[PDB]
Design an enzyme around this catalytic site. Structure first.
Site, short mmCIF file in Angstrom:
data_model
loop_
_atom_site.label_atom_id
_atom_site.label_comp_id
_atom_site.label_asym_id
_atom_site.label_seq_id
_atom_site.Cartn_x
_atom_site.Cartn_y
_atom_site.Cartn_z
N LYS A 243 0.86 -1.18 0.00
CA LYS A 243 0.00 0.00 0.00
C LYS A 243 0.90 1.24 0.00
CE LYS A 243 -3.53 -2.77 0.49
NZ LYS A 243 -4.54 -2.99 -0.59
N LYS B 173 -2.39 1.45 -2.64
CA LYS B 173 -2.70 0.61 -3.82
C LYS B 173 -1.94 1.09 -5.04
CE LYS B 173 -7.02 -0.68 -4.32
NZ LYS B 173 -6.99 -2.05 -3.77
N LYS C 105 2.58 -8.90 -2.30
CA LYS C 105 1.92 -8.91 -3.61
C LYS C 105 1.67 -7.52 -4.18
CE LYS C 105 -2.64 -10.03 -3.90
NZ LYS C 105 -3.08 -8.63 -4.25
N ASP D 289 -0.92 -5.00 -5.63
CA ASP D 289 -2.36 -4.83 -5.52
C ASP D 289 -2.96 -5.26 -6.86
OD1 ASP D 289 -4.70 -4.06 -4.00
OD2 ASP D 289 -3.53 -2.47 -3.12
N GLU D 290 -4.21 -5.73 -6.83
CA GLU D 290 -4.89 -6.21 -8.02
C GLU D 290 -4.83 -5.22 -9.19
OE1 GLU D 290 -6.85 -5.62 -5.06
OE2 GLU D 290 -7.32 -3.66 -5.91
N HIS E 296 -6.38 -13.50 -8.07
CA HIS E 296 -7.18 -12.47 -7.43
C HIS E 296 -8.57 -12.47 -8.06
CE1 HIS E 296 -8.58 -8.54 -5.97
NE2 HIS E 296 -7.65 -8.64 -5.04
N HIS F 74 -8.45 -16.14 -3.57
CA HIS F 74 -9.06 -15.46 -2.43
C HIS F 74 -10.42 -16.06 -2.07
CE1 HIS F 74 -6.45 -11.62 -2.33
NE2 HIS F 74 -5.90 -12.45 -3.19
N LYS G 150 -13.04 -6.78 6.32
CA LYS G 150 -13.82 -5.64 5.78
C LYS G 150 -14.78 -6.02 4.64
CE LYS G 150 -10.22 -4.15 2.52
NZ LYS G 150 -8.95 -3.34 2.38
O1 CAP Z 1 -7.22 -4.30 -2.15
C1 CAP Z 1 -7.38 -4.81 -1.01
O2 CAP Z 1 -8.21 -4.31 -0.21
C2 CAP Z 1 -6.54 -6.03 -0.63
O3 CAP Z 1 -5.22 -5.79 -1.20
C3 CAP Z 1 -6.39 -6.19 0.87
O4 CAP Z 1 -5.80 -5.04 1.43
P1 CAP Z 1 -5.67 -4.96 3.02
O5 CAP Z 1 -4.87 -6.15 3.47
O6 CAP Z 1 -4.93 -3.70 3.35
O7 CAP Z 1 -7.04 -4.99 3.64
C4 CAP Z 1 -7.11 -7.31 -1.25
O8 CAP Z 1 -7.03 -7.22 -2.66
C5 CAP Z 1 -8.53 -7.63 -0.83
O9 CAP Z 1 -8.46 -8.45 0.32
C6 CAP Z 1 -9.31 -8.35 -1.91
O10 CAP Z 1 -10.52 -8.79 -1.34
P2 CAP Z 1 -10.98 -10.32 -1.41
O11 CAP Z 1 -9.91 -11.18 -0.79
O12 CAP Z 1 -12.29 -10.44 -0.64
O13 CAP Z 1 -11.19 -10.74 -2.85
MG MG Z 2 -5.80 -5.51 -3.34
#
Ligand code: CAP
Ligand code: MG
Ligand code: CAP
Ligand code: CAP
Ligand code: MG
Ligand code: MG
Ligand code: MG
Lengths: 140, 466, 467, 228, 356, 140
Positions: free
Chosen positions: B166, B168, B192, B194-195, B285, B318, B325
């Site tokens: 982070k 992102k 990783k 971020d997506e 992801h 995932h 959250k």
């Molecule tokens: O973008 C985000 O929020 C995360 O990088 C988590 O960040 P944090 O660790 O800072 O919360 C993940 O991609 C989510 O968990 C995806 O959700 P899911 O696993 O439900 O698909």
């Molecule tokens: Mg993410």
């Protein structure tokens, strides 16, 4: 703010971030193997063969992805198939560490249904190892 | 026999077959169906069966050149939904002959292609699919799977630990690698992209790959443990996606990632095959899933999207956290975690498993619990998932008051303390707080994390109820 | 001391709610229909959406200080209440152009719709519209050809194009497929097509189909003197299989292929569109799976966004809805995104669900395709809704004709040309359409037969996707 | 159960007469002739063992895995009517034992080593049950009967073919001369003899070229699709 | 030669006993990628038979467990280990995972013992394309040796692979899986000696030859005949060993015979007497069935081999004093003593079907 | 169960698994060379050049298959062509080991019909070698 030390702070996978296991804590882990019907086994390595390295990759084309030397250690005897006696495992730990007092020794267990190692942790490091920290010297 | 008769007739005359005995090679679908007023459930179920298989809105003469009995989809059962006046579970059987071997794309195109948009229904949700062994066997599947992954990484006896970097977006390639190094060296197995981190003006992908490789190798040499970072191969074109995967291969790094729904099944299957052939782990992801899977009345349940990913190919997927959250109830998650990991999963409607699923030795996919989780959630996470999961702490690492390495150490300490307590016979549901508090006594890193996030919970009414 | 790192959770709205922000002309804008959980202020919910689709997470991270959050953060800059709704709001989010990979629809979706729809703190979320700025549009190759080029290549002008899905959907052999295609094309249809789910299957392998279809195409073209085509499906399980099929179509010299862009995916689609541009194939896009995403008013992504995304990723045709057929889509809603698909510049018009003025900066237009449960009596309405720049597809409406495919094609072609002629002559198709069709029946037995069979057939149901 | 080193009877692990075959199992019917003093059960078990997971002595590595899951199983033994020392042994192999889409691998397990065992006098594989879940792993025939008829536009009678003779010794041009004369008289196909590949008297590419000329001449002359 | 004639109504049975392949035809073949001399030179191994071992159970092991077994086998004194003939790529173990773990094992054992080590990685596959993919991976891992089932994969694929191995410096081990379907019966089929000549021509560095004393059939005199046909440059007609024709190989390299199948430490003297040094002797169960595990198992076989070779070199009659040489070695080798105790009573003695 | 040691247990190909050869046993091996008409030869290497290694492969593309450094040792004089006197071979062993007392020395023999080394074994290791076990210490 405390600072996590990068110097002589080598770890050893599972349970290496906890304080060193007492004999009672080790025995509890052995009871867990037995309670679950897993296959106990000991593995060992001399200090030079203990950590993951890359030396064999000199021989490779572009195929080193997820190849590392020193993942395999040396098997102490055989996996203890059919073992249901934790004292038997504890006696092999004693026997292995006596035969190889300067080696790293780890206790592992196999699940034959998943066909994978299902647990593992270091039970001995050589007394000459200076490359690790006390739990309270991990950060300064 | 029988002449062609032009004109419209009820779908139920051909496509509602309540006495049909399903074949062991049939693909089965459970549709939560909400008919328009005046449309009988039988006609609505038959319409769904027809228009996802062989039929259209009027009679066509060309049916006579082939055997409709052999090829037609069949609504063979309709259950009323308890608590609902106008909701039904319609069960549809599809002959194996309807499907392209090895193509999740084609399976979805038939089963969910057009039927959700029909005027004659108000809502439609695909709840489950029974993928028979004979169809499963047509797929390459996951590049490696859980057992092979653990063996390649040399990691056993605990959950794996990850972390999304982070913010992102907005970090430079060098700052990305700086953050990655600091995370990995403190005890995390993975970090990783971020997506949505692909290639952008603030950070081009190849710069990131290189700095991240430096970070991975520095942390690995420092800790003595195998490290990785899911480098994102998600891209605008298959050619760009492949270029990124090739670079990862040439850097010798363990693992890449793909956003399988936003990239798509066609690109995903290609990438999974590349990873199999080149020995790369593939992290998946599920970006965009909740657009499709959030609402109870309409869409596709995540358990179907998870089965589709297992077929298309992925080493991680995932799964949700229950306590973080993002939405997903514990019992629902446990159901599709079994569907992701296990070889054989019996029908269990109390976890939303509508069909017995036999995976015929297709490797299991590592569930990844991620999103709004921190150190106090650790006991619950270990209790829910057991060892075969990756637990990811993005904010839960980079939000630590002392930085990334102490943040990583806190999460690693918490994981190992919970694992140890579990192995010793302790009840993590009851004693989890005590396990964490005990560990705080010898771990200043954990104590600092516990203090910051002590009051933080995510508790809201669940939308996706069974 | 200045602003430093403070660990811990704070409200998203402190950073991501910026009601006084003046949007930049390079910003990507999103209109989200948002349903907050009880006790979550709309401002905090809008800010959470903006945060978690751009730069932020659930807790404060120190790394923000190495960069400039002001430069990169998504911004909820406006919140409108929804009329008739107690707990629905339109949240407007602005995304700096810097957040997006050039030419990547996949990446734009990953940010904007990636995680936010699953957040516990909201009950439902629907992406209604997106403002794609010229500066971002220009990063995309776009459609392989577009409407003008397509008409020029086909030498077809002055009327809608006519198409037809071969039926039954599945179960026909390659030879019987090419037989039906031949009979359809020779009667007056410009196109036939593989059903969306016709890829390669035990009953019919793709390359056998491609070959028999080529024979059928060329036979009907020689016979009628008009250019013919059949959308051969390149949709496949892998990019390599998809490409092989496109290659075979190129080597057969045939005009047009198809792709299911949502089930195949944007990554493969953009690749295929680029291949089509480089090799001069028309690309028909089928929107299989869209209604999984786009049907419900409260949750998902409205089709207009999926259409815009397709225009950017690349496609010469895209299915638009019929209004009057078996599948849902209201006339006024359809007209809105048809303008978004075809036109260069579309002004904001909330009465058609257009939340943002959209400037396409010369990106070619996509041919809307009206398809699904339509027949000869729908023709006047179809010509009135779409005008000439559409393809109208009659699958059952051709292969369901009592006399077969060629008479069925001819009836649809006669109905199209009669309605076009009447339109050109100044006739009101909404009022005189039935008369136009009945007049044509007098000299066209083929049309008369079709009219008789489908006279009573209408599809009228309560609309789910209301504005 | 621990590891016990040494030799034991195969029938202790590999003869399972109460096994219920699974619908994904590959099944094999072996006509088996045991040596004198070898019971049919031990002979069938040895075949099952040595075509799947077992060897001649107990190996410790079995314990790392699940032999129950992987082992071939002799589940039935029928006496052959008219024969004093012949049996049909029925073996079941788990689908997991086989490489997908590889006939090579299926043969290597099932017929690889067992035919040469000293403990048997003779062995014949009579039949195999290839389950749907295995069949589906194979691409299979390029076209098949229906598609072939459709491509050739030939319906309603057998197809007619003919091997050019003498087997070997004809030149490429003479080969095409003979092919043309055959095809134009009403045969649908002619063919290279099995041993006609590429040889000093006739190189393959010369033959392909002359044969193409012949195919197209006969097809133009008769109005029927021709091939060689 | 064997295409149609065996099926003719006018005969009741037909067996191809032998073929005379003339120098002028032999010269048209690339032949073995390397051959015995070049193989010994690349491995730096001289003065004794080579020792191998098939990993067991045949099927069912994971890639990691495969490499674990390989390392333990190689480190105890075996020169080679191998994939079982039917180990290709399966749901329990995919080939590329195996290749990588086996490479680790090879390099660990080689660094540990100081001797060159190898493991025959199986390139046998459903298509030539898959087969080549596997050979390419072996080349890129830098490992010495791959294997092929030349009868079940077939001559066309085999020749291609042998040519690849020649061009890329890989040793090629040949497994004769399926041979006994063809070569067992005296009245019908093709004798193995012809299948061995065909393999020499097609290309192979090793080829299984039989043991005489193990679990699979093949008489000593019959074996000695085709071992000569496999290794030597010129073999005179000798009907007492089933050699119907004088065979001149015109300098085509020799193929290393591989004795494998149901053999153990007590067979060592007979094996060394039959084969001499130019053979590989393989102990799968005879290693993985040792009571103390793979490394002790390997050491027992290695000790037994060296003890017999030393006794041979000193002028001792192995055919006649084999037991004493083995029993003497047991006095200083506990590993050998443990192996000797387990397998003492184990013999394979049955009526021979394939008689001359 | 005894455990084969992975530590300082380097071998040397043919005969290294037997007890160290006595002078009478070496003489018997030399008699075997002479009885068979083979060509005796001595080769030697310093300790760093004794075991197979991979260092040259840093210069390679993907061509390291069956390439190893240190297979070649240094020839002591020339191969003893036409030697039929075992005492002559034993005298060269003495001569070679005296000139290179800290080298590894092996005795080999060539067959010129097969054109291959037909036998070979170590006759000397330097007294400083600590990477080998006596026969009774190979397992524990
Ligand atoms: O973008 C985000 O929020 C995360 O990088 C988590 O960040 P944090 O660790 O800072 O919360 C993940 O991609 C989510 O968990 C995806 O959700 P899911 O696993 O439900 O698909
Ligand atoms: Mg993410
Ligand atoms: O499968 C079908 O139903 C169709 O082939 C039409 O068949 P008929 O012509 O026989 O009705 C089209 O794919 C749908 O129109 C898709 O719907 P949309 O355009 O709304 O995406
Ligand atoms: O599958 C087996 O049985 C082996 O792996 C040996 O196992 P063991 O060492 O455990 O007996 C070999 O493939 C056979 O020797 C082949 O027979 P042949 O050499 O006659 O072709
Ligand atoms: Mg369709
Ligand atoms: Mg013939
Ligand atoms: Mg074998």
């Amino acid at each position: 703010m405390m600072v996590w030390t990068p110097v002589n702070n080598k770890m050893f996978e599972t349970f290496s971030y906890l304080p060193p296991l007492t004999d009672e804590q080790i025995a509890a882990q052995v009871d867990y193997i037995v309670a679950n019907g897993w296959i106990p086994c000991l593995e060992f390595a001399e200090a030079d063969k203990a950590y993951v390295s890359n030396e064999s990759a000199i021989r490779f084309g572009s195929v080193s992805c997820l190849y590392y030397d020193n993942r395999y250690w040396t098997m102490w005897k055989l996996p203890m198939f059919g073992c249901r006696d934790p004292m038997q495992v504890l006696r092999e730990i004693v026997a292995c560490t006596k035969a190889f007092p300067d080696a790293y020794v780890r206790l592992v267990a196999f699940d034959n249904q998943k066909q994978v190692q299902i647990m593992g942790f270091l039970v001995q490091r050589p007394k000459t190892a200076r490359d690790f920290q006390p739990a309270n010297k991990r950060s300064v | 026999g029988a002449g062609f008769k032009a004109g419209v007739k009820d779908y139920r005359l051909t496509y509602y077959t309540p006495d049909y005995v399903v074949r062991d090679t049939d693909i089965l679908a459970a549709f939560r169906m909400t008919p328009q007023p005046g449309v009988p459930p039988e006609e609505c179920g038959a319409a769904v069966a027809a228009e996802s298989s062989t039929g259209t809105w009027t009679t066509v003469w060309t049916d006579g050149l082939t055997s409709l009995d052999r090829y037609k989809g069949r609504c063979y059962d309709i259950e009323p939904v308890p608590g609902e006046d106008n909701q039904y579970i319609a069960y549809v059987a599809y002959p194996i002959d309807l499907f392209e071997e090895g193509s999740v794309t084609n399976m979805f195109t038939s089963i969910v292609g057009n039927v959700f948009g029909f005027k004659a229904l108000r809502a439609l949700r695909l709840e489950d699919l029974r993928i028979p062994p004979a169809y499963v066997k047509t797929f390459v599947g996951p590049p490696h799977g859980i057992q092979v992954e653990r063996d390649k990484l040399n990691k056993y006896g605990r959950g794996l630990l990850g972390c999304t970097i982070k913010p992102k977006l907005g970090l430079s390639a060098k700052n990305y690698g700086r953050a990655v190094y600091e995370c990995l060296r403190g005890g995390l197995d993975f970090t990783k992209d971020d997506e949505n981190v692909n290639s952008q003006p603030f950070m081009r992908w190849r710069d990131r790959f290189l700095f991240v490789a430096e970070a991975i190798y520095k942390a690995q040499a420092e800790t003595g443990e195998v490290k990785g970072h899911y480098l994102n191969a998600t891209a605008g074109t298959c050619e760009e996606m492949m270029k990124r995967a090739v670079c990862a291969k040439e850097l010798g790094v363990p693992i890449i990632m793909h956003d399988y729904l936003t990239g798509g099944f066609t690109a995903n299957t290609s990438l999974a095959i590349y990873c199999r052939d080149n020995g790369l782990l593939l992290h998946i992801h599920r970006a965009m899933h909740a657009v499709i899977d959030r609402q109870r009345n309409h869409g596709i349940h995540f358990r179907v999207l998870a089965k589709a990913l297992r077929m298309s190919g992925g080493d991680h997927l995932h799964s949700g956290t229950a306590v973080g959250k993002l939405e997903g109830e514990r019992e629902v998650i446990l159901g599709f975690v079994d569907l992701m990991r296990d070889d054989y999963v019996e029908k269990d409607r109390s976890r939303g498993i509508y069909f017995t699923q036999d995976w015929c030795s297709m490797p299991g996919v590592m569930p990844v619990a991620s999103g709004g989780i921190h150190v106090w959630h650790m006991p619950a996470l270990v209790e829910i998932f057991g060892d075969d999961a990756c637990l990811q702490f993005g904010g839960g690492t980079l939000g630590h008051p002392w930085g990334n390495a102490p943040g990583a150490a806190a999460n690693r300490v918490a994981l190992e303390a919970c694992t140890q307590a579990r192995n010793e016979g302790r009840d993590l549901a009851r004693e989890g707080g005590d396990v964490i508090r005990s560990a705080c006594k010898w771990s200043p890193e954990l104590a600092a994390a516990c203090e910051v996030w002590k009051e933080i919970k995510f508790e809201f009414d669940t939308i996706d109820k069974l």
